[PDB]
Amino acid sequence: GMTLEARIEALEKEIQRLNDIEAIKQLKAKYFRCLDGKLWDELETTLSPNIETSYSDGKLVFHSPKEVTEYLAAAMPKEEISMHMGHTPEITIDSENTATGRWYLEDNLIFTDGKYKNVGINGGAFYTDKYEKIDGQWYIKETGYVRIFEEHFMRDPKIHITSNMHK
Amino acid sequence: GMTLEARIEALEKEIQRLNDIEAIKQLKAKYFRCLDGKLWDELETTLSPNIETSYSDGKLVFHSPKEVTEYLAAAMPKEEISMHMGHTPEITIDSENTATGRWYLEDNLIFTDGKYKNVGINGGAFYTDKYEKIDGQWYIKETGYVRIFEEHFMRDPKIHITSNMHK
Amino acid sequence: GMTLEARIEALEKEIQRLNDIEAIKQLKAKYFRCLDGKLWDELETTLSPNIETSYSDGKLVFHSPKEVTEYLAAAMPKEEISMHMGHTPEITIDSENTATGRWYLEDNLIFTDGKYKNVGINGGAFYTDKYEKIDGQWYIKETGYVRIFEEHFMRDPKIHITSNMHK
Numbered sequence A, B, C: 001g002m003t004l005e006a007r008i009e010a011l012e013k014e015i016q017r018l019n020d021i022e023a024i025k026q027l028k029a030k031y032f033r034c035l036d037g038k039l040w041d042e043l044e045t046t047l048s049p050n051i052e053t054s055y056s057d058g059k060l061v062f063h064s065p066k067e068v069t070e071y072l073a074a075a076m077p078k079e080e081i082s083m084h085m086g087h088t089p090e091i092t093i094d095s096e097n098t099a100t101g102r103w104y105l106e107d108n109l110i111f112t113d114g115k116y117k118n119v120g121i122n123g124g125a126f127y128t129d130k131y132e133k134i135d136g137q138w139y140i141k142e143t144g145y146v147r148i149f150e151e152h153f154m155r156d157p158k159i160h161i162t163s164n165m166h167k
């Protein structure tokens, strides 16, 4: 049936897809690691320079990955321990340089100091991301979510936090 | 040594395996997303028409994916927030159209209304699934588990749930 | 441009990388499953015979996978329910037989009996592992971490544990 050339072409396309899926999984992994490590300069490298600006009365218009990370740093201050835990991705490669990804998030936040001292926040969400490939590298272009649930409460003050990377 | 044809054949087999593993990971991802989103019609599409009926005095015999989802809907009512979080899969492709998968589950359930209002249930489990491929698509054929642990308790009624997709 | 031989060689290298990444993901999955199942003999099979001995005044020098599992068994006794939950791996294949992996850990520990009866411990950590390939199989060579946070507390004694695989 098919020539060797045709069989090779098909393999090259299939492998490129698998390589792209794996790169996008590591991209999102790096995003969560840097977000929760508060490694803002490194986090910035996961964001597309063309990161999508979702339009709405009262929301911010971001002009750059740097502005996005300035917002995240303000939203995730030193006093806030965060864990953003990604599960069970569904990655679809839409074209040579675009992709979509679903991620199942669990998040746990603990405020250790300041106005929200001893507040805990837990929740879950289904994210839907868009990614884009620029010069052989994948970036996050747009990231949105539907909350499963979210809750807040006061932690028992007797809970002993014995390690905190942000201290 | 090997002819180009032989090297290509080997690549085609290896790539088919990786494609099948990735499809099975996205299959199980879709299962959890739809289960926790209570998207029962969509959940049904993840189940094999030949879904295995585990025989035991007092258990139900399912005749179709639809009957399985009717049971799940009764087991996971609107008043129950659920998170079924899959980790660290071990997927083995057993033949061209069959596979086995191990998944590490964490689950968190919260009842918001009705008889179990303010009950929380947490646990963990090791699942072992069987999958089957029909017309180029993977389906869940059988799904079983060993519980690591399970616990229940009354939640502090002062916990503020601020978002709930089921409301 | 490239000969068919060159295109095949490239595919073989790319596929070997993807196969190695998937094998390393299943390796770490098996590690967590056996650690939390307290399946010490099986856990041992995930560890390199050349498992790295991190040098420090007061620490143990391990001579074998078996000694490592003896330590883990002492550190994770029957009375301790553990869940070590791996997320969002970043696996890099460094050479034909070496690799590095980042994993995002959440851990939850519950003591059911003995000196720490009713103690809970929760936390998170970023692991950085080294792996090595011996006779076609990947093994864990070195495993280290930075804690995000760790906390301990007394559980409400009214929490009903209804299943425990270690009982």
Ligand code: NA
Residues within 6 Å of the ligand: A106, B106, C106
């Ligand atoms: Na959790």
Ligand SMILES: [Zn+2]
Residues within 6 Å of the ligand: A085, A087, A106, B085, B087, B106, C085, C087, C106
């Ligand atoms: Zn998790």
